[PDB]
Amino acid sequence: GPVPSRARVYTDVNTHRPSEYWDYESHVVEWGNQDDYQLVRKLGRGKYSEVFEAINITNNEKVVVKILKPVAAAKIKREIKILENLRGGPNIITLADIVKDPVSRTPALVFEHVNNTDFKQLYQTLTDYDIRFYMYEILKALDYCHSMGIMHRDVKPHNVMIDHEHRKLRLIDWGLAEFYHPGQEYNVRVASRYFKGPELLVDYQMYDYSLDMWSLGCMLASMIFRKEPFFHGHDNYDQLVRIAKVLGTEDLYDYIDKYNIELDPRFNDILGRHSRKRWERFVHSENQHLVSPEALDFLDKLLRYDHQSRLTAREAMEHPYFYTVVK
Numbered sequence: 394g395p396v397p398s399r400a401r402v403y404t405d406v407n408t409h410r411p412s413e414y415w416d417y418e419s420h421v422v423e424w425g426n427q428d429d430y431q432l433v434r435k436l437g438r439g440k441y442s443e444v445f446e447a448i449n450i451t452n453n454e455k456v457v458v459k460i461l462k463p464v465a466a467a468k469i470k471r472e473i474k475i476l477e478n479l480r481g482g483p484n485i486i487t488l489a490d491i492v493k494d495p496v497s498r499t500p501a502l503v504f505e506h507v508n509n510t511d512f513k514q515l516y517q518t519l520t521d522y523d524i525r526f527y528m529y530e531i532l533k534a535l536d537y538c539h540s541m542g543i544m545h546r547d548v549k550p551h552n553v554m555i556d557h558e559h560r561k562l563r564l565i566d567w568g569l570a571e572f573y574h575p576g577q578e579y580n581v582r583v584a585s586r587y588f589k590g591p592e593l594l595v596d597y598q599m600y601d602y603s604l605d606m607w608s609l610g611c612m613l614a615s616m617i618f619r620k621e622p623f624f625h626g627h628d629n630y631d632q633l634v635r636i637a638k639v640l641g642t643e644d645l646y647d648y649i650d651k652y653n654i655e656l657d658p659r660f661n662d663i664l665g666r667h668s669r670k671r672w673e674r675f676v677h678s679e680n681q682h683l684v685s686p687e688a689l690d691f692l693d694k695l696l697r698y699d700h701q702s703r704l705t706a707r708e709a710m711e712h713p714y715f716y717t718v719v720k
């Protein structure tokens with residue numbers, strides 16, 4: 394059957410931490426006071442929760458409250474433990490409190506507020522310099538969480554908060570985040586369609602931190618080529634075909650042969666035969682100001698089928714693409 398895989402970095406971080414670190418089920422939640430927070434307005438509703446802008450009346454500061462739906466109320470300890478483990482880390486959203494919502498009777502997570510008043514799609518209107526600057530800021534968060542034995546598993550623009558006025562970035566929504574344990578088989582139903590790595594699409598469960606680096610490459614490709622999303626799958630099956638139309642089918646077949654993966658036979662009639670396209674195929678007069686040989690080389694090194702071949706967050710921070718960014 395499938396060949397095993399393990400991360401090439403931070404492989405054993407959880408084995409050398411005390412069990413209290415990663416055994417989230419044993420964690421005892423310290424509950425705050427729901428009365429400290431006054432809900433102001435609804436910001437959005439997901440499949441398992443709703444988010445509100447709120448005021449912490451003990452300091453008159455804005456906060457964001459995520460109220461869990463009764464269905465998710467049970468599996469909150471994983472997210473809580475990860476948020477507490479990562480608290481204070483570079484560009485990681487701060488969990489300010491955990492309270493029981495008086496209406497839903499479910500857990501409510503209280504987060505640091507980031508000014509989210511930059512309307513439109515700042516995501517598709519940044520300058521070349523600002524793309525590099527913010528990409529480096531995301532990498533500080535990803536190297537931190539990966540160094541802390543945690544995979545985010547939902548890297549996408551909707552989970553990157555930017556206060557453009559103060560050039561502040563936070564990586565949010567650790568609701569799909571997991572502890573990495575070598576040899577552990579994980580659920581492939583993670584990340585959002587357009588940002589799903591090939592490992593998820595071919596049903597390879599023994600993945601690791603490198604899944605976040607594929608998602609990151611999808612964001613970079615979308616920004617530098619002004620193509621939102623870069624890999625525009627109609628469903629999870631077509632998502633792999635869209636990738637194959639860019640990266641080619643040969644490397645895809647080499648990847649599945651290397652890990653002894655059994656490709657879903659539904660792929661036989663839709664994958665076809667494609668050769669790798671050179672990255673300049675995506676360059677045109679409207680995106681040429683964001684494209685550089687450094688950007689293309691960096692992107693090439695993130696968007697690889699083989700999860701063990703992609704740059705790690707630390708290798709990515711060493712890339713020449715970031716030499717122009719003030720440190």
Ligand SMILES: NC(=O)c1ccc2c(c1)nc(NCCOCCCCNCc1ccc(OC(F)(F)F)c(Cl)c1)c1ccncc12
Binds near residue numbers: 486504523616
């Ligand atoms: N943990 C929680 O559940 C959580 C924690 C905190 C918040 C939260 C959820 N949801 C909030 N609003 C609802 C979700 O609103 C998502 C808007 C995302 C906007 N991408 C902006 C953007 C712009 C440019 C980008 O490119 C780059 F290169 F990075 F520069 C990228 Cl990748 C992304 C919120 C608002 C204010 N302050 C804290 C929170």
